[PDB]
């Protein structure tokens, strides 16, 4: 009998690996003629059709809490954002001593005391003459020097004005593994993020993942199938957030009704500052709307699943955040270029014991923006003319459990902004990268000639 | 009768020049912190590099035509400049200063070496100014004609070195890429040129610390058996005479002042660290070196210089000839502060066939490192008392005089060129490219 | 009975687009001229071109669909910016000026063309300012309302051209990567399109000077035999006609003004070069060209324009149909001075079937190259008088009007696009991709 080693090259065997996946965007998007911070133009074009191959009899182990595709997406998103603001105007000369007064013309009772009317001396295009100008600033952007104000960022760092020729609207981008690697896609409907995946497939690029930046509420994301899924790294912990994914989307309208005007202030050769002119009409508050019927059931679906982890006879509560800075204690996003900070204390409320209404969520606005929890890298968002309104649907939540001990009768979950990579971890939970290892050796009855 | 047989993989090499890449000990310095010649971005070095000794192969080395030196120079400079790119630029500091002498408990030796200046500067808000003051060393300021200005304002605006990045010389290992090799010379008495009977090949060079100094090689590799005199042409006066010690010489250097640092806000997120005030007595910096230890070391140097200049020659050491401070003094770095010590107490003797020598040392904060023009750097002050205990392992000498008649050779320290500082570490290395194709006759023939 | 057999390395190619790299001789590099067309970036060129003539081959070219022109355009612009990256930005020059006419010796022709302006200015020290003056041409100052300002201040600040660098064109060869080839058409009567019976292949193109000009192609390559007329759609009035003379017409350019350079320090390590005062009399800068050699050349151009428009047509010339200064005039560069000569005296004739003609020329220093906006450059004034002589080796013409089918054709000068200056040099070359695999039938089957 006997056997001799036989060498096979090209065998289907792979091992987990980490590498650099390259982007892939739709070709037609380039014809929009306007660039976006995500640099879809510099990103590779996508293939005309998707190529996916189903793999029978194969079981693989996934882990969404140690996936490295998220850590690369986090760096790419930060890197793209910075590169877009490198060539834009730097608002150092705006760190001067302002003189402000309240606006009261057609001021709504709720909104009184939020918008300031500030005036300051500024240089003109000529380096000798100076001009007296004014601009409206929200109260969250200015502080008093201890009637006399200053921008909040001056004692921390200067900000680069956002170029009005670049957009913030998400543009779907696919992550493609280069040659010698592959991406495995868990096709299971009830996958909970870790463990075996009975169904798997290989694809050349991931689906279109929109880099939506949001807090406490995952918008415009992907919806689950046949149920609501609760996904936590260690469900019986308290410092690990919970990534609920909604089965059925819930719509949330939001608006900034003010009919404000833009105004260009030239502060140097070829560089201009886009200030805010006087408003047109009444001064009101920004807000989003949520149908109370769909939100009342959508928490009805969520509570039932949570009963499968913490108890079948526990009293599930909800509460209004934990407290802290607006960037974590509110639902933040940008709608049209204006950055909202909505107080969602009314969505999470009431306790669970075992048709034409709405829930209005007041929202603040801001212009001096720190995006990625970084210190000294602010940005200034220019104002947008005309009322801006956006309609989107929520598709998840980022909750946190307070961890009560010896009184397990009730578990209270509060929304949590967590880290920004949890926002994208909810879209890459199906994917993992594997490195192909073509060389293999097995025994057979063959031998070499001569 | 015989046919051409081609072999692929033969051990043949030829001298070549390519690009080597860095590699640091990595795990040896865990909890790493940022610094120039970035420890990160260097491929981590293997825990046990494999050195292979080649049996009876003789290679002709040359340390003065070496290209690893030229690439290291352009490489150390590049790492230096790319670290100053993000730090503060002190344009606002090029203003009119009003300085008065420092006399608060000052010693006669340091009577007027540091001034006390007040100047106007803007604050975070551009429309308001602040009046600030700082202590400046007299070497950094020039009178305008009580009104002084920083010495660099009419040449360039200096960048303030970031305080979070250190100047500590972390060791570096230069590695040759695939298809190349690095030949080490194992001979104890190899004078830097000519055949080296003992040869070996390594993946990367040993740990080389880029210690920038002058006329004294600090923290260097020692000669294994004897003091070695190395020069390109010993009979040439215009060639610096490198010297290597077989025994280190401790040099204790310190700054005995208790300086305080003060932060002045000159813009959004920008601070210029002024020298707040000196707490206590004001005394000059200095280095110490044992008189008996050094006088022994110079004895060996003469014992070997005689081999090249004869038995009977009288050999006198003398202090540097002259020039600018950057070249005529033992300039170096100690803890981030830049010293310039007057070495006239070391090189002072005439040689015929417990007590510590103290060298007065000066300080500066406007530094021009690589002899360039217009790229000054401002080293922020360091709070406390500075001290370094490095030990000496070489010299950079020069000679002069003599034309058709001589009986007593005089040597002086010198050398401001920095590639002479790393030429002392890479004298036992060279890079070659492997050539695997070889054709030799054999009796075999192809079948068809 | 036949089977498939594969051949590797067959001579087959197909049209393609790739990145071509520049290669120049080291004459400018060895002496450190530092031309803006960086030869430091470009690789060393081969000692002598190697051209292979491909007999029996027919190839179809198209000079208008050639992509080498669109890749050279981006190369030239990019090399331009990289040279201006370190040069000082003239942001402090945007102040209110106070100008008065110069009349010391100004001749009536140039009366009012330059002004004597004075202004506050910065200094090395941040707390002081200086009062200085400089002569600015009339085209580079707009009355602000005896108070003017630089014309660019409301759009962008200009970087002053590093005086050390040079604008003089130097040949740059475009070389094909591995697996690609360049095919040169050698047919003399080749009209820039269609099959070219005779072809060769070269590794790199001939030296092409990136000469920037308008309405007249200078220092170019001359045709052979007869004058060649080339247009994309010669029956379209929207397409420019790229003439190419077979003999070079010589043009002499100069500015007699003996202006002086003056350096003003506007900050730490930075300087601004003012225009000083002019020694002697101030007069106009002109360009000469023989009226006899220019008359015969149009006689040779007209008999070729006849073949494409008829023998009985009255061929008439006119001057540019108005517009901007940069397009209505023959704008070029020589000696660092940007001329904008008025060519209305060259194109004025009617053809129905020693002496010189002088062209007044203006000068300006705020320059917006490549038809870009907001990226101006300031050209420093040059010492002394400037003179230069050059070929005239082609034109850029345009028709106008459609009143009649064919009665009278008037051809005006053009130059609205900068690529046409380079389409007249690369019209001979096309880049191809080599596909070495090839399968054909043969009587051969694998044994065993």
């Amino acid at each position, epitope marked *: 009998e006997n056997l001799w080693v036989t060498v096979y090259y090209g065998v289907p065997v792979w091992k987990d690996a980490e590498t650099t996946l390259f982007c892939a965007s739709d070709a037609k998007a380039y014809e929009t003629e306007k660039h976006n911070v995500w640099a879809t133009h510099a990103c590779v074009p996508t293939d005309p059709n998707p190529q996916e191959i189903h793999l029978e009899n194969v079981t693989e182990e996934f882990n969404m809490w140690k996936n490295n595709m998220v850590e690369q997406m986090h760096t790419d998103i930060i890197s793209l954002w910075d590169q877009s603001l490198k060539p834009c105007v730097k608002l150092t000369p705006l760190c001067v001593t302002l003189q402000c007064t309240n606006v009261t013309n057609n001021i709504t009772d709720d909104m009184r005391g939020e918008l300031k009317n500030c005036s300051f001396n500024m240089t003109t295009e000529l380096r000798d003459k*100076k001009q007296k100008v004014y601009s409206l600033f929200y109260r969250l952007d200015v502080v008093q020097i201890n009637k006399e104000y200053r921008l909040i960022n001056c004692n921390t760092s200067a900000c680069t004005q956002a170029c009005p020729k670049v957009s913030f609207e998400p543009i779907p981008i696919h992550y493609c593994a280069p040659a010698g690697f592959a991406i495995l896609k868990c096709k299971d409907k009830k996958f909970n993020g870790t463990g075996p995946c009975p169904s798997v497939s290989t694809v050349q690029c991931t689906h279109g993942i929109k880099p939506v930046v949001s807090t406490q509420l995952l918008l415009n994301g992907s919806l689950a199938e046949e149920e609501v899924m609760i996904r936590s790294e260690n469900i019986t912990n308290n410092a690990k957030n919970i990534l609920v994914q909604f089965n059925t989307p819930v719509q949330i309208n939001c608006t900034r009704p003010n009919n404000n005007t833009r105004k260009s202030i030239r502060i140097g050769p070829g560089q201009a500052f886009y200030a805010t002119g006087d408003i047109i009409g009444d001064i009101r508050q920004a807000h989003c709307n949520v149908s109370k019927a769909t939100w009342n059931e959508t928490l009805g679906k969520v509570v039932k699943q949570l009963r499968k982890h913490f108890g079948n006879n526990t009293i599930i509560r909800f509460a209004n955040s934990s407290g802290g800075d607006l960037e974590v204690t509110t639902h933040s996003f940008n709608c049209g270029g204006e950055f909202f900070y909505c107080n969602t204390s009314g969505l999470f409320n009431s306790t669970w014991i075992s048709s034409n209404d709405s829930i209005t969520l007041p929202c603040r606005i801001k212009q001096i923006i720190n995006m990625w929890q970084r210190i000294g890298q602010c940005m200034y968002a220019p104002p947008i003319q005309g009322v801006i309104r956006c309609v989107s649907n929520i598709t998840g939540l980022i909750l946190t459990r307070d961890g009560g001990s010896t009184n397990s009768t009730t578990e209270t979950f509060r929304p949590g902004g967590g880290d920004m990579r949890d926002n994208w971890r909810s879209e890459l939970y199906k994917y993992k990268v594997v490195k192909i290892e073509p060389l293999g050796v097995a025994p057979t009855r063959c031998k070499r000639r001569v | 009768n015989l046919w051409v047989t081609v072999y692929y993989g033969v051990p043949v090499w030829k001298d070549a020049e390519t690009t080597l890449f860095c590699a640091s000990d990595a795990k040896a310095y865990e909890t790493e912190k940022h610094n120039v010649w970035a420890t990160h971005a260097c491929v981590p070095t293997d825990p046990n590099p494999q050195e292979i000794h080649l049996e009876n192969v003789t290679e002709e080395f040359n340390m003065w035509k070496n290209n690893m030196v030229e690439q290291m120079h352009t490489d150390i400079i590049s790492l230096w400049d790319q670290s100053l790119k993000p730090c503060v630029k002190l344009t606002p500091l090029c203003v009119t200063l009003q300085c008065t002498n420092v006399t608060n408990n000052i010693t006669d030796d340091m009577r007027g070496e540091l001034k006390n200046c007040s100047f106007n500067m803007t604050t975070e808000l551009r429309d308001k100014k602040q009046k600030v003051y700082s202590l400046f060393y007299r070497l950094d300021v020039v009178q305008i004609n009580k009104e002084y200005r920083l010495i660099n304002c009419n040449t360039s605006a200096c960048t303030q070195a970031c305080p979070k990045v250190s100047f500590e010389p972390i060791p570096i290992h230069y590695c040759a890429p695939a298809g190349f090799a690095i030949l080490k010379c194992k001979d104890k008495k190899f004078n830097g040129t000519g055949p080296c009977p003992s040869v070996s090949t390594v993946q990367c060079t040993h740990g080389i610390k880029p210690v920038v100094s002058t006329q004294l090689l600090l923290n260097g590799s020692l000669a294994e058996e004897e003091v070695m005199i190395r020069s390109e042409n010993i009979t040439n006066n215009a060639k610096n005479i490198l010297v290597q010690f077989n025994t280190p010489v401790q040099i204790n250097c310190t700054r005995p002042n208790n300086n305080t640092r003060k932060s002045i806000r000159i813009g959004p997120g920008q601070a210029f660290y002024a020298t707040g005030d000196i707490i206590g007595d004001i005394r000059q910096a200095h280095c110490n070196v044992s008189k008996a230890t050094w006088n022994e070391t110079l004895g060996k140097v003469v014992k070997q210089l005689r081999k090249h200049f004869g038995n009977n020659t009288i050999i006198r050491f003398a202090n540097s000839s002259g020039g600018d401070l950057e070249v005529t003094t033992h300039s170096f770095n100690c803890g981030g502060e830049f010293f310039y010590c007057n070495t006239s107490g070391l090189f002072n003797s005439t040689w015929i066939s417990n007590d510590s020598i103290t060298l007065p040392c000066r300080i500066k904060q406007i530094i021009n490192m690589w002899q360039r023009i217009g790229q000054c750097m401002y080293a922020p002050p360091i709070q406390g008392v500075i001290r370094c205990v490095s030990n000496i392992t070489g010299l950079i000498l020069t000679r002069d005089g003599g034309s058709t008649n001589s009986t007593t050779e005089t040597f002086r320290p010198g050398g401001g060129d920095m590639r002479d500082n790393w030429r002392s570490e890479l004298y036992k290395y060279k890079v070659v490219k492997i050539e695997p194709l070889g054709v030799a006759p054999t009796r075999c023939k192809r079948r068809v | 009975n036949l089977w498939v057999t594969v051949y590797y390395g067959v001579p087959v190619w197909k049209d393609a687009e790739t990145t071509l790299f520049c290669a120049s001789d080291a004459k400018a590099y060895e002496t450190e001229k530092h031309n803006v067309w960086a030869t430091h970036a470009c690789v060393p060129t081969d000692p002598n071109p190697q051209e292979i003539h491909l007999e029996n081959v027919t190839e179809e070219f198209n000079m208008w669909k050639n992509n080498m022109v669109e890749q050279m355009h981006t190369d030239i612009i990019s090399l331009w910016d990289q040279s201006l990256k370190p040069c000082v930005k003239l942001t402090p020059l945007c102040v209110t000026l106070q100008c008065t006419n110069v009349t010391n010796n100004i001749t009536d022709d140039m009366r009012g063309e330059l002004k004597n302006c004075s202004f506050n200015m910065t200094t090395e020290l941040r707390d002081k*300012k200086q009062k200085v003056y400089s002569l600015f041409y009339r085209l580079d100052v707009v009355q602000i309302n005896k108070e003017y300002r630089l014309i660019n201040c409301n759009t962008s600040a200009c970087t002053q051209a590093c005086p050390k660098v040079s604008f003089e064109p130097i040949p740059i060869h475009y070389c094909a990567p591995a697996g690609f080839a360049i095919l040169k058409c050698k047919d003399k009567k080749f009209n820039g399109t269609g099959p070219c019976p005779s072809v060769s292949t070269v590794q790199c193109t001939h030296g092409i000077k990136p000469v920037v000009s308008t309405q007249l192609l200078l220092n170019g390559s001359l045709a052979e035999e007869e004058v060649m007329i080339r247009s994309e759609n010669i029956t379209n009035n929207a397409k420019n006609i790229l003439v190419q003379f077979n003999t070079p017409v010589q043009i002499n350019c100069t500015r007699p003004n003996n202006n002086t350079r003056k350096s003003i320090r506007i900050g730490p390590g930075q300087a601004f070069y003012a225009t000083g005062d002019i020694i002697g009399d101030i007069r106009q800068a002109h360009c000469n060209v023989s009226k006899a050699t220019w008359n015969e050349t149009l006689g040779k151009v007209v008999k070729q324009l006849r073949k494409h428009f008829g023998n009985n047509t009255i061929i008439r010339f006119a001057n540019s149909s108005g517009g901007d200064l940069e397009v209505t005039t023959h704008s070029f560069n020589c000696g660092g001075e940007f001329f904008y000569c008025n060519t209305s005296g060259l194109f004025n004739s009617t053809w129905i079937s020693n002496d010189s003609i002088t062209l007044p020329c203006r000068i300006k220093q705020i320059i917006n190259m490549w038809q870009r906006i907001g990226q101006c450059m300031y050209a420093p004034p040059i010492q002394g008088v400037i003179r230069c002589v050059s070929n005239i080796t082609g034109l850029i013409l345009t028709r106008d009007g459609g009143s009649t089918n064919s009665t009278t054709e008037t051809f005006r000068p053009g130059g609205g696009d900068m690529r046409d200056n380079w389409r007249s040099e690369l019209y001979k070359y096309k880049v191809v991709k080599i596909e070495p695999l090839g399968v054909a039938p043969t009587r051969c089957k694998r044994r065993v």
Partner: antibody
Amino acid sequence: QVQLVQSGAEVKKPGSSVKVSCKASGNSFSNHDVHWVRQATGQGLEWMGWMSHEGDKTGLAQKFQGRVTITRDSGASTVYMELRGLTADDTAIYYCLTGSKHRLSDYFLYNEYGPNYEEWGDYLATLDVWGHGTAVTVSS
Amino acid sequence: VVITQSPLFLPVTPGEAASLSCKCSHSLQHSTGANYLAWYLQRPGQTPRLLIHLATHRASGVPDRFSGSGSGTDFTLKISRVESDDVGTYYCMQGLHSPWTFGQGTKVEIK
């Protein structure tokens, strides 16, 4: 021509205050400055104070610091000087007049980003036009 | 800051000449050296008239017979071709140092 008008004379008891009123032709106070001087029988001229024509500056001598304040109406059509703390020695004749000043740059400090810092110093050139002259007396 | 004048009295006859002096507290080397000095002449029942400003310029309508000079802490004024109307008191006012002040006064009378 620029000309000034003032109010009539008054008499007050010690410790009271007098607020004089002054007017000018053509609203010259919008283009030139205003200064105040008084003089008594056998006594020399005594500079009191002034106000800039832009309104940026209003200076008075230490002799009348706190005891005097100056204000003017809209359009610079009328200007008032108020003296409080009247005493017997204050009996004199007060004059309304206009003077010219030199505005010079005293200290400069450049800025890349923002308006360059500057400090301006006023200097008294001349007194141009005097007013009618108002007599104020303090008596029991 | 203080100012003084001399002589205190000047008995003059028509056709004669007279000279006056003025003092400045500080040798302030600024504003063209001679800096800002103002002279005035007053008579009883009449508002004073400006005579010299900037220490060297003749006021509008003033005959050329009046001139002044000085610098630093001292200043001087001169008169010539005296006539009857020249009687009165002359004041020198310092316009540089804030607060500004008049002078003691120098009287001129017929002789």
